[PDB]
Amino acid sequence: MKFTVEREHLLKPLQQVSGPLGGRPTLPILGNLLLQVADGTLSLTGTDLEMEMVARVALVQPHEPGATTVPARKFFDICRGLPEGAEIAVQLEGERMLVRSGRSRFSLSTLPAADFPNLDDWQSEVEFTLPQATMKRLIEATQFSMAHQDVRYYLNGMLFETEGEELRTVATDGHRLAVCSMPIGQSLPSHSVIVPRKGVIELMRMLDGGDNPLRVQIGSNNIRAHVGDFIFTSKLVDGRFPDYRRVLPKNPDKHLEAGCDLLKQAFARAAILSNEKFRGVRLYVSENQLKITANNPEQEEAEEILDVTYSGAEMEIGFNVSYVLDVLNALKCENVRMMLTDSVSSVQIEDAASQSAAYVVMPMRL
Amino acid sequence: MKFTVEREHLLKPLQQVSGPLGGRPTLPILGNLLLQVADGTLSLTGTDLEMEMVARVALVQPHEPGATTVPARKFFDICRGLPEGAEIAVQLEGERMLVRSGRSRFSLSTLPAADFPNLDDWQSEVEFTLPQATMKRLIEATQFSMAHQDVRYYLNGMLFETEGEELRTVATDGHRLAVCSMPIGQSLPSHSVIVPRKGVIELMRMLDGGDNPLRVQIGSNNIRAHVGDFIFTSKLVDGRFPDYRRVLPKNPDKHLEAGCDLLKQAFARAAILSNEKFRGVRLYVSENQLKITANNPEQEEAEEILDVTYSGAEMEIGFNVSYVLDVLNALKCENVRMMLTDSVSSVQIEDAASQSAAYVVMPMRL
Numbered sequence: 001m002k003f004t005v006e007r008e009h010l011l012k013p014l015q016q017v018s019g020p021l022g023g024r025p026t027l028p029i030l031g032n033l034l035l036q037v038a039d040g041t042l043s044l045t046g047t048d049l050e051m052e053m054v055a056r057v058a059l060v061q062p063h064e065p066g067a068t069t070v071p072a073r074k075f076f077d078i079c080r081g082l083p084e085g086a087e088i089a090v091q092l093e094g095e096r097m098l099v100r101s102g103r104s105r106f107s108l109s110t111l112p113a114a115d116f117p118n119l120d121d122w123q124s125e126v127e128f129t130l131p132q133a134t135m136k137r138l139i140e141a142t143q144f145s146m147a148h149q150d151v152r153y154y155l156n157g158m159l160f161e162t163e164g165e166e167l168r169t170v171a172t173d174g175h176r177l178a179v180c181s182m183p184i185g186q187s188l189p190s191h192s193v194i195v196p197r198k199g200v201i202e203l204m205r206m207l208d209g210g211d212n213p214l215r216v217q218i219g220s221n222n223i224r225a226h227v228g229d230f231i232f233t234s235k236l237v238d239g240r241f242p243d244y245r246r247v248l249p250k251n252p253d254k255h256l257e258a259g260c261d262l263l264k265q266a267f268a269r270a271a272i273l274s275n276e277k278f279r280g281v282r283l284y285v286s287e288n289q290l291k292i293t294a295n296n297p298e299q300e301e302a303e304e305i306l307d308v309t310y311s312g313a314e315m316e317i318g319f320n321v322s323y324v325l326d327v328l329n330a331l332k333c334e335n336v337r338m339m340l341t342d343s344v345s346s347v348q349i350e351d352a353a354s355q356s357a358a359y360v361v362m363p364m365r366l
Numbered sequence: 367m368k369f370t371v372e373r374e375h376l377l378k379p380l381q382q383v384s385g386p387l388g389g390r391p392t393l394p395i396l397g398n399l400l401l402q403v404a405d406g407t408l409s410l411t412g413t414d415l416e417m418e419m420v421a422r423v424a425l426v427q428p429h430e431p432g433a434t435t436v437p438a439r440k441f442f443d444i445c446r447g448l449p450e451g452a453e454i455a456v457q458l459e460g461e462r463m464l465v466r467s468g469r470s471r472f473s474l475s476t477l478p479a480a481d482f483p484n485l486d487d488w489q490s491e492v493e494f495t496l497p498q499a500t501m502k503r504l505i506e507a508t509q510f511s512m513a514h515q516d517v518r519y520y521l522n523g524m525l526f527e528t529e530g531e532e533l534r535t536v537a538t539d540g541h542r543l544a545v546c547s548m549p550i551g552q553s554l555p556s557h558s559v560i561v562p563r564k565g566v567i568e569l570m571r572m573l574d575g576g577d578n579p580l581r582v583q584i585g586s587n588n589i590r591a592h593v594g595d596f597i598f599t600s601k602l603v604d605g606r607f608p609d610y611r612r613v614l615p616k617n618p619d620k621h622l623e624a625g626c627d628l629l630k631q632a633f634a635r636a637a638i639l640s641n642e643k644f645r646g647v648r649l650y651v652s653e654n655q656l657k658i659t660a661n662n663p664e665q666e667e668a669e670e671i672l673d674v675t676y677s678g679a680e681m682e683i684g685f686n687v688s689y690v691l692d693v694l695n696a697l698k699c700e701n702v703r704m705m706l707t708d709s710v711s712s713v714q715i716e717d718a719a720s721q722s723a724a725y726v727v728m729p730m731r732l
């Protein structure tokens with residue numbers, strides 16, 4: 001195996017296939033990158049045995065086919081540390097990979113490519129394309145509502161659902177939920193899968209905000225995403241994910257509208273004097289007014305009063321203010337709508353000018 | 367006690383006296399800010415019993431004299447959380463301190479000002495002034511060479527020495543040393559003191575880069591620095607701080623000059639394949655050439671060759687590459703001079719254009 005590639009044509013793929021900072025790995029070889037030269041292409045692969053990242057680099061300079069594996073971080077750091085425009089010449093010498101550029105020389109330990117884990121081929125059952133910006137919006141809208149290392153593994157992931165011409169994400173941890181839907185202009189089969197946290201992170205990381213579209217393929221136990229000359233694949237998560245349709249309050253009779261930032265800053269200040277564990281705040285809604293209160297065990301108290309748009313019946317309700325602040329921070333908009341029912345029911349929160357995303361927060365008895 | 371102050375006039379002082387995050391106070395009340403209204407001035411004080419930060423703010427709106435203490439972080443966060451232009455009205459009502467602005471109300475728990483530790487008065491023995499830029503230069507030149515939680519506490523601090531018309535800082539961890547001297551245009555007595563790590567951090571934090579000169583007072587066991595309407599005091603550290611004059615190599619006549627960035631990038635690449643614990647690299651100097659090599663226990667190897675300016679005798683020497691990189695990162699200059707003796711002696715490193723700072727690194731047997 002031999003190749004010579006310009007620094008700039010290696011750096012991006014090497015970064016693409018790096019994956020998360022974890023370790024120590026199950027096998028030593030999982031800390032290595034698989035390098036394969038065949039048919040005029042260098043392929044670079046990283047895996048943790050469940051997800052896999054593969055980049056392809058066309059080789060315009062002379063090259064010889066073959067494969068090896070090398071320490072991923074060291075190889076990347078070497079390439080990154082070389083000067084702009086550097087010609088990175090790679091070859092094998094016994095059990096080492098030689099990397100040479102100008103008067104810089106490196107010798108890295110290898111492990112056999114034949115020993116690198118090859119995940120099984122699988123069959124696509126659902127396929128669609130969408131802009132990178134749409135995937136970005138879908139994941140960012142909901143990601144914060146995924147559970148955190150819950151024993152119910154399925155809540156730690158994110159639902160991806162096709163219905164009609166829309167892709168939808170749902171995330172929930174039992175206490176609050178987020179759902180976002182976006183049209184992608186294709187007739188889709190009705191289907192849903194659960195992508196694990198680590199897969200969601202990589203789906204986000206692979207977006208570069210350039211013009212390449214995202215091509216997705218869903219199998220029975222896997223999902224693949226292609227962007228340019230990069231492929232990411234992840235296992236799916238088993239389990240039945242909650243139906244968002246059952247979580248949206250059935251028929252909220254009361255609607256409140258307010259400036260997002262004004263509302264956010266009022267909750268943020270009140271939150272300072274809320275219980276550090278339970279984070280409870282109380283809302284009192286009245287004609288065009290919201291009063292927010294908070295107190296903690298040492299009897300410190302916050303009160304905020306705001307003008308808002310509200311003509312419904314007066315009511316009182318408690319919420320975990322972190323959950324509310326999470327939502328207002330994910331809504332990146334001028335005005336918000338809160339859809340209420342009563343003090344023992346959930347609230348739905350949305351951009352006042354868009355129903356693309358909805359958020360549900362359950363009340364607290366206070 | 368009563369005052370009303372405009373938010374932006376309160377925020378800077380509150381931040382000035384906040385001190386470090388991640389605090390373990392040795393008395394609960396040290397988590398509180400001391401507020402004192404007297405003679406038309408609000409003073410704000412924070413302390414950990416060893417250092418103390420005091421800000422004074424002139425009160426142009428009605429006020430009433432008195433003192434109390436309140437949780438520091440909550441008070442700051444409340445004021446920071448209020449909108450731009452907010453007027454903050456504060457009133458002490460027994461066990462509670464009321465903080466109100468617009469339609470935002472807060473009540474904070476108080477502890478009596480009478481219970482707030484008052485550090486003893488002490489006598490200045492050495493005094494001088496200097497531009498803030500000179501203090502910044504002196505600290506930034508040497509701070510990185512202080513030890514990291516060494517059991518010899520003096521090594522964790524920074525020596526401040528007056529000699530002639532110069533102020534000098536020295537920092538060392540027992541293996542590498544940094545020293546920087548700057549003229550301050552005043553005839554000084556000969557004196558040296560050790561400022562603890564936390565004091566160095568605050569000396570740096572209190573610089574605003576404005577025209578306010580730094581006024582320094584040194585006593586037998588304390589130091590004080592005044593800038594504008596802010597005073598910082600720190601206890602000094604006991605111990606026998608190393609004499610930099612004995613650490614500088616006596617006759618380092620073999621002088622090598624090289625571009626800082628080229629030297630740095632070569633060391634940074636070689637470092638990748640150095641021992642992760644011991645970080646050893648070897649330097650081979652010869653006419654107008656430097657070769658750097660590194661290897662680790664897996665027998666991975668790096669080699670770098672650069673052109674340099676060198677007409678001395680040939681020699682090799684081993685160094686901890688992290689220490690060398692730390693120096694080159696601190697220098698921020700075009701060219702560097704390395705001043706060598708032999709394979710069992712230390713190296714002195716300087717900006718080739720300035721002798722105001724010097725750095726010493728001990729050799730390694732490799």
Ligand SMILES: [Ca+2]
Nearest residue numbers: 014017018072
């Ligand atoms: Ca990588």
Ligand SMILES: [Ca+2]
Nearest residue numbers: 103104669671
């Ligand atoms: Ca070389």
Ligand SMILES: [Ca+2]
Nearest residue numbers: 118119120121
């Ligand atoms: Ca495969």
Ligand SMILES: [Ca+2]
Nearest residue numbers: 153156157196
């Ligand atoms: Ca999962």
Ligand SMILES: [Ca+2]
Nearest residue numbers: 255310311312
């Ligand atoms: Ca209404």
Ligand SMILES: [Ca+2]
Nearest residue numbers: 370425426427
């Ligand atoms: Ca005032």
Ligand SMILES: [Ca+2]
Nearest residue numbers: 461476477478
């Ligand atoms: Ca009190």
Ligand SMILES: [Ca+2]
Nearest residue numbers: 484485486487
């Ligand atoms: Ca005092």
Ligand SMILES: [Cl-]
Nearest residue numbers: 004005006009
């Ligand atoms: Cl190329």
Ligand SMILES: [Cl-]
Nearest residue numbers: 083628631632
């Ligand atoms: Cl370079």
Ligand SMILES: [Cl-]
Nearest residue numbers: 382383571572
């Ligand atoms: Cl400060």
Ligand SMILES: [Cl-]
Nearest residue numbers: 652653654655
């Ligand atoms: Cl030579």
